[PDB]
């Protein structure tokens, strides 16, 4: 299974995942495509916000779904 990540800059990168993958794993796959650590990652799909430890089966994420990546801002 392959899925999509659209950053705010419109760049869509493709990832290879299978439906049981944790979001925390997806954020690591996203890290080695874009060089941004998971503690800086926030994932938005279907209007909701993807949570760590939940998996993509949980969110009914399926082939060619497009995830949105925005800045997870911590202490600001």
């Amino acid at each position: 299974m392959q899925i999509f990540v659209k950053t705010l800059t419109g760049k869509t990168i493709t990832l290879e995942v299978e439906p049981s993958d944790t979001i925390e794993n997806v954020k690591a796959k996203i890290q080695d495509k874009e060089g941004i650590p998971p503690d800086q990652q926030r994932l938005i799909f279907a209007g909701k916000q993807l949570e760590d430890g939940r998996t993509l089966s949980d969110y009914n994420i399926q082939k060619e779904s497009t995830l949105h990546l925005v800045l997870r801002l911590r202490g600001g």
Binding site: K6, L8, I44, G47, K48, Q49, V70, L73
Partner: protein, 188 residues
């Protein structure tokens, strides 16, 4: 569907004029009010909806509860982009409006758009959230433009567990307009 009085609060703050949500975040919000009204109205003929500018210099009631599309439209024209968003105040006047809704069999719901940085305290907002929950009001925030979620902790606070009535919509600039994303959301 379900019999309810709902109040639409819009962010009319200086942030409302922006490219990212076509045509502007404000205008996004207008098409959204129109859609949402026409929706709630046809899920049950008894629904009635209100409108609240949530910014400016003091949140104000643009239209009381109606079935009338004309006075939603009259209240929608005659608001203005100006000032900053006063969230907790807006939420207070929305709650005050719902308490006095005619026909008390109507479930209470407020739906609010936030396209601004939230100036209010997290504490005031969480108190307010717990209060709202206690008074049996359900809340839907629309979170676009600057996406900061506080909002997650708010909806967390205000949600009624045994009937899950309170949703957060986080939406990013994109191909679809804002009202479409709202149509497909759990706010339906």
């Amino acid at each position: 569907m379900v019999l309810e009085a709902t109040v639409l609060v819009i962010d009319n703050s200086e942030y409302s004029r922006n490219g990212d949500f076509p045509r502007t975040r404000f205008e996004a919000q207008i098409d959204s009010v129109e859609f949402i009204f026409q929706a709630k109205r046809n899920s049950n003929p008894e629904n009635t909806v209100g409108l609240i500018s949530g910014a400016g210099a003091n949140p104000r009631v643009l239209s009381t509860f109606t079935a009338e599309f004309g006075k939603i439209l009259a209240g929608l024209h005659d608001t203005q982009i100006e000032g900053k968003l006063h969230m907790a105040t807006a939420l207070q006047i929305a709650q005050l409006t719902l308490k006095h809704r005619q026909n008390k069999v109507q479930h209470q719901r407020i739906v609010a758009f936030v396209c601004s940085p939230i100036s209010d305290s997290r504490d005031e907002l969480i108190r307010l959230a717990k209060t709202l929950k206690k008074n049996n009001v359900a809340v839907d925030i629309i979170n676009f433009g600057e996406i900061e979620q506080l909002l997650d902790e708010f909806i967390a606070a205000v949600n009624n567990p045994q009937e899950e009535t309170s949703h957060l919509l986080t939406v990013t600039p994109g191909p679809r307009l804002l009202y479409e994303n709202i149509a497909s959301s759990p706010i339906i």
